[PDB]
Nucleic acid binder design. Structure first.
Length: 46
DNA sequence: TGTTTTTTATAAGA
DNA sequence: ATCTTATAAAAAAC
């Protein structure tokens, strides 16, 4: 199954996340479940 | 109708 | 309420 978000997008979200933005809007906006996000970017990694 | 890869809800957190 | 995390069920591929 295709990863939820291509590499680039990671580079993109990795940013937003480190500048603030909530793991929920991103999830929403990017159309991907919150759990997926805590997976790619664990809380203990910011 | 079957295997594999990744998602994603969900339940649980000395 | 809230935020995190591992998981267990299943979707999305072909």
């Amino acid at each position: 199954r295709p990863r939820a978000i291509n590499k680039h997008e990671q580079e993109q979200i990795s940013r937003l996340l480190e500048k603030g933005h909530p793991r929920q809007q991103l999830a929403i906006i990017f159309g991907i479940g919150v759990s997926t996000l805590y997976r790619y970017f664990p809380a203990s990694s910011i």
